[PDB]
Design an enzyme around this catalytic site. Sequence first.
Site, PDB file in Angstrom:
ATOM      1  N   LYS A 162       0.825  -1.195   0.000  1.00 18.40           N
ATOM      2  CA  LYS A 162       0.000   0.000   0.000  1.00 18.40           C
ATOM      3  C   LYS A 162       0.859   1.246   0.000  1.00 18.40           C
ATOM      4  O   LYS A 162       1.460   1.605   1.006  1.00 18.40           O
ATOM      5  CB  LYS A 162      -0.944   0.020   1.209  1.00 18.40           C
ATOM      6  CG  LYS A 162      -2.050  -1.022   1.176  1.00 18.40           C
ATOM      7  CD  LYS A 162      -2.955  -0.816  -0.019  1.00 18.40           C
ATOM      8  CE  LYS A 162      -4.072  -1.850  -0.063  1.00 18.40           C
ATOM      9  NZ  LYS A 162      -5.087  -1.550  -1.081  1.00 18.40           N
ATOM     10  N   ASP A 190      -0.336  -0.528  -4.629  1.00 19.34           N
ATOM     11  CA  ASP A 190      -1.681   0.043  -4.660  1.00 19.34           C
ATOM     12  C   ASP A 190      -1.697   1.398  -3.952  1.00 19.34           C
ATOM     13  O   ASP A 190      -1.368   1.489  -2.757  1.00 19.34           O
ATOM     14  CB  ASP A 190      -2.642  -0.930  -3.979  1.00 19.34           C
ATOM     15  CG  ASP A 190      -4.094  -0.563  -4.160  1.00 19.34           C
ATOM     16  OD1 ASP A 190      -4.404   0.561  -4.612  1.00 19.34           O
ATOM     17  OD2 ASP A 190      -4.935  -1.414  -3.831  1.00 19.34           O
ATOM     18  N   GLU A 216      -2.101  -0.347  -8.702  1.00 20.41           N
ATOM     19  CA  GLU A 216      -3.532  -0.131  -8.671  1.00 20.41           C
ATOM     20  C   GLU A 216      -3.838   1.331  -8.399  1.00 20.41           C
ATOM     21  O   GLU A 216      -3.241   1.949  -7.521  1.00 20.41           O
ATOM     22  CB  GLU A 216      -4.178  -1.005  -7.591  1.00 20.41           C
ATOM     23  CG  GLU A 216      -4.351  -2.461  -7.967  1.00 20.41           C
ATOM     24  CD  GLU A 216      -4.859  -3.289  -6.808  1.00 20.41           C
ATOM     25  OE1 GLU A 216      -5.885  -2.911  -6.222  1.00 20.41           O
ATOM     26  OE2 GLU A 216      -4.237  -4.321  -6.480  1.00 20.41           O
ATOM     27  N   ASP A 241      -8.789   0.312 -10.212  1.00 18.84           N
ATOM     28  CA  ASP A 241      -9.612  -0.287  -9.175  1.00 18.84           C
ATOM     29  C   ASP A 241     -10.859   0.552  -8.934  1.00 18.84           C
ATOM     30  O   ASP A 241     -11.911   0.273  -9.492  1.00 18.84           O
ATOM     31  CB  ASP A 241      -8.823  -0.474  -7.885  1.00 18.84           C
ATOM     32  CG  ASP A 241      -9.584  -1.300  -6.852  1.00 18.84           C
ATOM     33  OD1 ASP A 241     -10.839  -1.313  -6.865  1.00 18.84           O
ATOM     34  OD2 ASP A 241      -8.916  -1.936  -6.018  1.00 18.84           O
ATOM     35  N   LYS A 265     -14.078  -6.427  -8.480  1.00 16.61           N
ATOM     36  CA  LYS A 265     -14.625  -6.689  -7.159  1.00 16.61           C
ATOM     37  C   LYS A 265     -16.164  -6.772  -7.246  1.00 16.61           C
ATOM     38  O   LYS A 265     -16.808  -5.902  -7.819  1.00 16.61           O
ATOM     39  CB  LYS A 265     -14.204  -5.604  -6.158  1.00 16.61           C
ATOM     40  CG  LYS A 265     -12.710  -5.404  -5.988  1.00 16.61           C
ATOM     41  CD  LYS A 265     -12.418  -4.519  -4.799  1.00 16.61           C
ATOM     42  CE  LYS A 265     -11.117  -3.762  -4.950  1.00 16.61           C
ATOM     43  NZ  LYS A 265     -10.193  -3.961  -3.784  1.00 16.61           N
TER      44      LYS A 265
END
Length: 368
Positions: A162, A190, A216, A241, A265
């Site tokens: 992250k 991400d 991402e 995303d 997702k």
Amino acid sequence: MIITQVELYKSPVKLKEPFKISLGILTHANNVIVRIHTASGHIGYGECSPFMTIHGESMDTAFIVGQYLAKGLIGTSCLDIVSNSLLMDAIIYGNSCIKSAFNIALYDLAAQHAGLPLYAFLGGKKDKIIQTDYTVSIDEPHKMAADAVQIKKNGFEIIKVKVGGSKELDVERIRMIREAAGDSITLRIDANQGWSVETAIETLTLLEPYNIQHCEEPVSRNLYTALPKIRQACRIPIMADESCCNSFDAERLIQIQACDSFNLKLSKSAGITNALNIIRLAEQAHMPVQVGGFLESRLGFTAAAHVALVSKTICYYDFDTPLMFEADPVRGGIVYQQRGIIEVPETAGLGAGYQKDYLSGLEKICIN
Ligand SMILES: [Mg+2]
């Protein structure tokens, strides 16, 4: 098969360590569970994990809106998945997160009826190994390297990092990790919309040497039009995303060549039905897809895993958060093996449910 009642549950489970992204910090997975009952006595399970800064829903809102939805579904045929998905849309706009739970549960019932596991009911087949990454929370760089190590030690072969801080700091982060964990272990990053278009391009080129698999959502979902510029001025591939929620979003991103891959997702697409569309598009455009999620338990990720087996264009998997739970309330469902390899249930339906009287301890409502 007529729907006779639906139950909704507030399912808040505490995480071992707090989960940290550029957007914020979470201590709990505050999920909502959905159980649809048929006259024939079948039960379908769905789960969702509202994430306020992305879905714009919360456990509290989901629990309410879900009742609106249950009401409208009572009396309908749980097999008319498309009809019922439209029915829900006619009741309320957006709220994809909670809608997904209903959708998932409907598919559960549909697969049950057909006597197939979800993946097979969707036309998939077990012709590939599903391997999950594991996620290093955004923190002080030493902490982050430490975690990366523990993760490698626990046997995971893919790390998801992250990022989304200042250019300076994110590079120190990736470096400290790379030099504290190796160059062979595959790693993906991400940003969760963390960088400006500027900072993105600068950090992404400054990071290329460290061999990263994809990034991402580098910038604000609002600036998706700047994605094509970033894609071209940056080696590392970029994965949409938050910028890719439903099939329309997908088509639009493809049209302007915004990105190299998607992160699919079920919450963002309001269920399996539309996720299938996003997958089709990704196929026609030869785009790799990563299937992921939010803070769903293994029940939610079991649904994701079933969908993951639907197309060979899906080839990355982010199913880690259930491993962060203080306790696993799921019965059945996907099992985590060594190296983060995931095994999908083969029994009819979703192939998952909740432990006995875990549900009974939950704040719940019941729609007749
Ligand atoms: Mg993401």
